[PDB]
Amino acid sequence: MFENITAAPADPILGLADLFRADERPGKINLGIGVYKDETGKTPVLTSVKKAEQYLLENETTKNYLGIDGIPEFGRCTQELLFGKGSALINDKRARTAQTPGGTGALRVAADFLAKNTSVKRVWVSNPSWPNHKSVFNSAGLEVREYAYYDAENHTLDFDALINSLNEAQAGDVVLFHGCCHNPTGIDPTLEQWQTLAQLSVEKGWLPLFDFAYQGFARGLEEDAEGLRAFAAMHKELIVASSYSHNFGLYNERVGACTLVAADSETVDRAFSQMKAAIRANYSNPPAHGASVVATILSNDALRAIWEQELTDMRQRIQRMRQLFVNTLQEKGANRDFSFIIKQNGMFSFSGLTKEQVLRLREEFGVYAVASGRVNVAGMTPDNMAPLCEAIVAVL
Amino acid sequence: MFENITAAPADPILGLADLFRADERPGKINLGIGVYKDETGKTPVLTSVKKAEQYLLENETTKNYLGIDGIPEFGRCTQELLFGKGSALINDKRARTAQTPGGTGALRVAADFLAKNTSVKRVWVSNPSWPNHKSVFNSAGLEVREYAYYDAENHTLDFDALINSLNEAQAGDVVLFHGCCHNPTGIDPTLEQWQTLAQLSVEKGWLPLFDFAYQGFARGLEEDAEGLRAFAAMHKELIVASSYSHNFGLYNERVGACTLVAADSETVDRAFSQMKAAIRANYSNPPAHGASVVATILSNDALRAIWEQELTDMRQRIQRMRQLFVNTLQEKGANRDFSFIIKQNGMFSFSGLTKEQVLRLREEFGVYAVASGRVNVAGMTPDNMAPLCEAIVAVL
Ligand SMILES: Cc1ncc(COP(=O)(O)O)c(CN)c1O
Ligand SMILES: Cc1ncc(COP(=O)(O)O)c(CN)c1O
Ligand SMILES: O=C(O)CCC(=O)C(=O)O
Ligand SMILES: O=C(O)CCC(=O)C(=O)O
C-alpha cells in the first residue's frame, strides 16, 4: 500500500533548521528560527512557568482526563485576555473557548468545524502569510485564496491593494486576520485601518478569523488586541485562534485556544457542541500541563506580575535589536535605508533581500534566513550583530 | 453563519458522566467511566510518574519545540515495547513512530495519512467497538464497515462469524484489530486465533491497523503484544496506534504513538514524511510533558521497575474484582451464571444486561452503566461490591 507513496515537500520553515545544524561552520547565525532567543542565544523556561510547574507538581492529585474544551479558568482567563475584562461578549456569554494543542491545533479545529458545520468553502489569507496556514485549511478541504497586503517597494501595508483584493470575496467567506505581529512582514493595520476593515467586514458579510499567536509582542498585551476588539465590537460572529507558545515560552507543551463568539448564548452553545464534536474525533481532549501552567500564572497576581515583566523584557529585547540592527547596518556601510525595520512588530521582518542574496548569506557566510528574506530579530544578539551586518552589507 | 447549526448528539461514553455527577443520590456507583479507579475510588498519579515529573522540573532548560514525530527515545522505547527488543522490524529499520496526542490522536493521524496518501476507502471495525472509532475514521472521509465478533448468547468471540464477515472485504481495505482488552467486550482472540487472522490477513491482502490502548492490563506487557507480534511476523506493512493513557495513568497529558511499519527502510521513510505532513497541518508537533515522563520512566531501570509494579498492581486489582464480582453475585442470589466475567480482560465487560435493566439500575439504584451493559470493573471496590451486586440481582 505504501510502495508508491511519494516523498512530501520539505517545509519552508522547518527544513532550513536541518541545513543549519548540519552545515557545521564557525560563527554561523540562524535567523530562520521561529522561536524567541535571548541575549545568550537560548530559549529558556520562563521563571514564572517554572514556578507554576512546582506548584502543580506538589498539588496534582490525578491525571484524569480533561473535558473536550479543557480547563475552565484557562478558558476564562484567555477570554478576558482577548476581549478585555468587562467585555459584553463575556458578560452576555457570547463567546466559548476550547483548549487546543497550540494555535495550529485551534486553526485546524476551526477548519473542521467550519468545513463540516457551515457553508464556508473558502478562506482568504494574506500574501504573504505563515505557510502552514494554506495547509491546515486545505487539509480540512477548504479553498484558500490570497488577498494583497505588503508593498515590496515601500515596505508597508498597502491598504488599497488589500481592500481591493478583498472585493467581491463573497458573503460567507472566511477572511483570516493576523491580530498582531504579522508573520512574516511584521507590518500591521493601524487602529484606523482595523476599524475600516471592521466596517467593511460587516457591510460585505465576511466571517473574520483572528490568528492571534504573539499577543504581547507588539506594543503590550491590551494594545495588541485593539484590533480584535474593534472587530468584536461590530460583529455577531467571530473566531479567534490564539497560542500561548510565544508569550509564555511554552512552545513544546502545545498551548492555545479556539474561541467562538456567536450572536447570543444559545447559539454559541449549539455551535460549540459541534466544535466539541470535531475535537472529540481529532485528539479527544486537550493536554493539561501547559494550559495548567498558563491558568495558574494568569490567576495568581504574584505570578502574573512576574510573567508580565518576563513578557516585557522579551518585547523590549526585540525592540532593542530592531534599533541596533538598522544602526549597526548604517554604520558598516549599508547602502540602503533599512529604517522600516523599526516600524515593524514582534519577532520577524522581511529584510528586503533577494532569493539569491539569501543564498549568498548561507553559502559564503554563516547567515541563515528563510528564502523569503524573513529574518527573526530574536536571533540577533549584540554579540552577533556586527558580523551579521557585515555579511548583509557584503551582498547588498 | 452559525444561526442554524444543529446540536450534535451526546457522546455514548462521555454524556453519562454528567448524568451521574448531577444526580446527587447517596451510595451511587459509576461503572460507566473509562478510567482506572483504585480501592479508595480515585485515579492517582503513579508514583513513578511523579518521580519523573520532579526529574524534569529540575532538568528542563527549554521548552522549545519538538520535531513533528516528537521525542526520539519516546519513539524507540515504544518500538521495543510493541515489537520486543530484538525485533527484525527494529533492526532492519522498517518501523517509524510519531508521538501523537493520545491513542485517539494516533488513530486520527493514521486516518488522514491513509485518506490522503493511499487508496483506502474503508476500514473494518468490530461489532461492537469503542464508539469514537467510527468518528475518527469518518472525520477523515473513510467508510467504516463492521465485522462480527461477539456472541450475546455465549458471551464469547465467535470466530466463525468474525471470519465470514471479513470475507470479500476487498484487498487494500484497512482492518482494525484491538491488540488486547477489547473495549467493550473484554473478549480477545487466542494466540491460535491471532495466528489465523494473521495468515488470512496476507492471503486476502488487508492492511491491519492495531489499536493498542491497554498494553499490560490483560496478562502482562509482552503477552499482550503476542497478537500484534504474530501479525508483524507475517506482514510487510502494518500500522499501530498505542496509548500510554491507561498503563501510565497519564490520561490528561495526551500520550500515544502512531507507528508505521513498511516493507523496508526507504519506504517507511517516504511514507512517514507524508505522515509528518499530516501532523504538521493538524497540531504541528506533539505535547512534550507526558511523553517526557514516559521516556524517562522507560529508560531508567529503577523507575521502570517501580512503574512495572504499579502496572501489575492495577492489573491484579482488576483481576481481583472480576473474581469477587462473580462470587459476590453468586452469593447474593444471582440467578445467572456470570462466570464469563473472569474469562475477559482489562477494565471492561458487557454485563449481559438489557437497556431496560441498565435504566432500572440507574433510576432505582445508584448503579451507572453505559446503555450497552458495559461495566468498568475498575470502578468496583471491595466496599461497593455488595450494594452493587444487590442491585444487579434485583433487576435480573
Ligand atoms: C501566524 C501564526 N499562527 C499560528 C502559529 C502556531 O502556533 P503554535 O506553534 O502555537 O501552534 C504560529 C506559530 N508559528 C504563527 O506564526
Ligand atoms: C480501543 C481504544 N482506542 C483508543 C482509545 C483512546 O486512547 P486515548 O485516551 O489515549 O486517546 C481507547 C480508550 N480511550 C480505546 O479503548
Ligand atoms: O517550528 C514550528 O513548529 C513553527 C514555528 C514557525 O513556523 C514560525 O514561527 O515561523
Ligand atoms: O477518551 C475518553 O475520554 C474516554 C474513553 C472511554 O470512555 C472508554 O474507553 O470507554
Side-chain angles (χ1 to χ4, degrees):
Chain A
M1 203 102 36
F2 306 149
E3 299 100 334
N4 172 255
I5 293 189
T6 54
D11 192 87
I13 309 304
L14 276 41
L16 185 268
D18 287 274
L19 220 171
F20 175 79
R21 169 200 58 58
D23 113 302
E24 55 216 0
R25 202 95 59 67
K28 65 178 184 180
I29 304 174
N30 191 2
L31 300 171
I33 61 176
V35 133
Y36 177 72
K37 215 278 309 180
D38 64 357
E39 186 195 21
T40 82
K42 61 185 79 290
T43 319
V45 193
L46 253 50
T47 286
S48 44
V49 157
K50 224 120 185 77
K51 283 205 144 114
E53 296 193 283
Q54 184 59 271
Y55 180 83
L56 300 180
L57 212 208
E58 297 171 357
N59 280 87
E60 273 180 326
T61 52
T62 186
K63 275 191 185 298
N64 199 25
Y65 295 112
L66 295 174
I68 287 176
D69 41 343
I71 296 166
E73 339 61 55
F74 172 87
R76 321 176 314 139
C77 269
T78 109
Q79 259 167 64
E80 300 175 4
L81 195 47
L82 275 337
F83 301 130
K85 209 172 186 67
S87 201
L89 275 82
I90 303 173
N91 298 141
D92 302 334
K93 211 271 90 209
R94 298 209 287 113
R96 297 287 246 119
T97 292
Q99 180 187 333
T100 66
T104 310
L107 239 33
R108 182 56 187 259
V109 159
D112 299 314
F113 162 81
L114 295 170
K116 324 294 145 60
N117 289 279
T118 245
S119 60
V120 171
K121 188 219 156 149
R122 163 185 254 187
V123 59
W124 286 88
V125 312
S126 63
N127 192 315
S129 195
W130 169 53
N132 202 59
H133 275 147
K134 191 179 301 270
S135 318
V136 296
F137 292 118
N138 276 356
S139 287
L142 258 32
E143 229 217 311
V144 341
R145 294 275 115 258
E146 282 147 70
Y147 54 99
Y149 190 78
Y150 166 68
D151 184 349
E153 299 183 67
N154 280 257
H155 308 125
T156 39
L157 192 226
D158 84 302
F159 198 46
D160 297 289
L162 136 61
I163 205 154
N164 289 333
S165 49
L166 269 190
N167 263 256
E168 178 57 275
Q170 350 227 267
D173 270 357
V174 173
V175 190
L176 200 158
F177 299 106
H178 290 39
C180 75
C181 302
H182 180 281
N183 179 11
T185 67
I187 296 158
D188 295 339
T190 60
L191 189 267
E192 276 190 55
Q193 304 186 103
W194 278 117
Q195 252 145 188
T196 302
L197 294 168
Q199 240 142 240
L200 189 78
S201 194
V202 293
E203 191 240 91
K204 248 73 193 307
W206 303 322
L207 185 83
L209 206 171
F210 278 88
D211 191 0
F212 232 138
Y214 301 93
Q215 193 177 182
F217 274 82
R219 147 179 62 116
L221 224 53
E222 293 283 271
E223 291 122 297
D224 295 4
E226 308 157 331
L228 170 84
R229 270 126 95 149
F231 274 75
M234 312 213 179
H235 293 56
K236 296 285 167 185
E237 307 181 333
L238 186 141
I239 287 177
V240 196
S242 43
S243 157
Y244 290 106
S245 286
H246 287 83
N247 55 186
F248 268 83
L250 229 22
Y251 306 109
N252 69 12
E253 291 300 349
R254 304 283 73 218
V255 193
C258 185
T259 313
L260 239 219
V261 9
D264 61 60
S265 191
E266 189 198 80
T267 312
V268 245
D269 284 3
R270 211 156 60 237
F272 197 55
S273 65
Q274 290 281 3
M275 202 177 245
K276 291 208 290 181
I279 299 167
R280 183 40 172 165
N282 185 350
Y283 50 80
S284 194
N285 35 62
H289 193 60
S292 258
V293 171
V294 178
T296 282
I297 298 171
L298 293 166
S299 67
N300 299 223
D301 296 306
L303 281 167
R304 185 172 172 148
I306 297 175
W307 169 58
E308 271 169 26
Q309 265 295 143
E310 308 212 74
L311 188 49
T312 301
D313 291 346
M314 293 193 290
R315 186 192 317 117
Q316 280 157 196
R317 192 204 167 233
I318 289 160
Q319 292 178 130
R320 259 60 138 158
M321 293 303 101
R322 306 198 85 120
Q323 279 96 66
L324 172 68
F325 178 52
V326 326
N327 283 141
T328 314
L329 229 18
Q330 268 47 107
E331 283 179 34
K332 306 320 257 67
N335 165 82
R336 216 158 202 93
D337 163 69
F338 288 86
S339 75
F340 64 93
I341 280 301
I342 304 175
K343 295 160 42 242
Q344 297 167 358
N345 305 144
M347 288 183 250
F348 302 114
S349 252
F350 260 160
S351 49
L353 262 44
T354 256
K355 189 260 182 172
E356 299 68 47
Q357 288 180 317
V358 171
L359 310 197
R360 258 263 258 177
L361 299 181
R362 309 203 316 237
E363 305 282 294
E364 327 254 281
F365 305 109
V367 199
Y368 280 67
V370 163
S372 60
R374 201 192 63 169
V375 291
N376 180 176
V377 158
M380 294 155 177
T381 66
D383 273 87
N384 66 27
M385 196 81 272
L388 149 53
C389 281
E390 297 216 59
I392 290 194
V393 165
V395 303
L396 277 191
Chain B
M1 204 134 357
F2 304 146
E3 303 96 332
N4 173 259
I5 291 202
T6 57
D11 194 280
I13 307 308
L14 279 40
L16 180 272
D18 289 275
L19 231 165
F20 174 81
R21 170 202 56 62
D23 109 298
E24 55 217 359
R25 201 92 58 69
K28 68 179 181 182
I29 304 183
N30 189 8
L31 302 168
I33 72 258
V35 136
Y36 176 73
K37 215 277 305 178
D38 63 359
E39 187 190 17
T40 79
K42 63 184 80 288
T43 317
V45 190
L46 255 50
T47 294
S48 52
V49 153
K50 223 119 183 71
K51 278 195 137 124
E53 309 198 280
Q54 184 59 273
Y55 183 78
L56 305 176
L57 225 199
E58 290 167 8
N59 283 93
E60 282 181 327
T61 50
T62 185
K63 278 191 182 297
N64 197 23
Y65 297 106
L66 294 171
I68 287 180
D69 48 327
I71 292 169
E73 335 67 59
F74 171 87
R76 328 172 311 138
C77 273
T78 110
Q79 264 164 51
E80 308 179 350
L81 200 57
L82 270 352
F83 300 133
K85 204 167 195 68
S87 197
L89 274 74
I90 297 172
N91 300 139
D92 304 338
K93 213 271 88 214
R94 298 208 287 115
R96 297 287 244 115
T97 295
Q99 180 190 340
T100 66
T104 307
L107 233 36
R108 181 56 187 259
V109 162
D112 301 314
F113 155 91
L114 291 173
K116 322 290 149 61
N117 290 278
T118 251
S119 57
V120 173
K121 181 253 166 109
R122 185 175 233 192
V123 61
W124 286 89
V125 307
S126 61
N127 187 320
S129 195
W130 174 52
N132 201 55
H133 271 139
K134 193 177 299 274
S135 312
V136 292
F137 298 115
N138 271 358
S139 287
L142 260 40
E143 234 219 314
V144 351
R145 295 271 122 256
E146 284 149 58
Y147 53 94
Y149 191 83
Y150 166 71
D151 189 340
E153 299 186 63
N154 278 260
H155 311 116
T156 41
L157 195 228
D158 87 304
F159 202 44
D160 295 294
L162 135 54
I163 212 151
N164 292 328
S165 52
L166 275 191
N167 263 255
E168 177 54 276
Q170 341 241 265
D173 274 354
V174 167
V175 185
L176 214 167
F177 295 107
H178 290 45
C180 69
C181 307
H182 176 274
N183 176 6
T185 67
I187 305 164
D188 294 341
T190 66
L191 185 267
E192 272 182 56
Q193 299 182 109
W194 275 118
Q195 267 152 175
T196 296
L197 292 174
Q199 231 140 248
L200 186 78
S201 199
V202 295
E203 191 233 273
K204 249 73 192 306
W206 303 322
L207 182 76
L209 199 180
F210 277 90
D211 193 357
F212 231 135
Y214 303 100
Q215 196 187 176
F217 278 73
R219 155 177 58 118
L221 228 44
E222 305 278 90
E223 293 117 297
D224 296 6
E226 319 148 323
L228 165 76
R229 270 127 103 144
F231 275 66
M234 308 208 184
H235 289 56
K236 298 280 164 188
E237 304 177 335
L238 189 143
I239 290 175
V240 191
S242 48
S243 162
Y244 292 113
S245 286
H246 289 85
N247 49 194
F248 277 75
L250 234 28
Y251 306 112
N252 68 9
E253 294 294 349
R254 306 280 72 221
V255 195
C258 197
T259 308
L260 201 256
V261 10
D264 61 51
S265 189
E266 196 204 69
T267 316
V268 241
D269 282 14
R270 209 154 62 231
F272 200 50
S273 67
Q274 290 288 2
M275 192 171 235
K276 289 210 290 184
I279 297 160
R280 180 47 174 161
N282 191 351
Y283 50 74
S284 193
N285 33 64
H289 196 55
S292 276
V293 168
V294 178
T296 286
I297 292 184
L298 292 177
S299 62
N300 298 219
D301 296 305
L303 282 169
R304 182 178 176 141
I306 301 172
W307 171 57
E308 272 176 20
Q309 259 298 140
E310 308 211 73
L311 183 50
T312 299
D313 288 348
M314 297 188 283
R315 188 192 314 122
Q316 276 157 198
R317 186 193 178 248
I318 290 167
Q319 294 179 124
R320 251 59 138 162
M321 290 305 110
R322 307 197 85 118
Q323 281 95 65
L324 173 72
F325 174 65
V326 326
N327 280 149
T328 309
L329 221 25
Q330 265 46 108
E331 289 180 32
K332 287 348 234 69
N335 162 90
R336 213 157 206 94
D337 161 71
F338 287 82
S339 79
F340 67 86
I341 287 293
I342 299 174
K343 289 164 43 251
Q344 290 158 13
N345 302 136
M347 298 181 236
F348 311 107
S349 263
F350 263 156
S351 52
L353 257 44
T354 260
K355 188 247 186 181
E356 300 71 40
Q357 285 180 323
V358 175
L359 308 198
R360 264 252 273 174
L361 292 186
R362 300 205 326 239
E363 302 282 288
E364 322 269 279
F365 304 104
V367 195
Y368 282 62
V370 175
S372 53
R374 197 195 67 169
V375 292
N376 187 165
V377 163
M380 291 158 179
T381 60
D383 278 73
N384 66 31
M385 201 66 260
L388 149 54
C389 288
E390 291 210 64
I392 284 192
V393 172
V395 300
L396 283 195

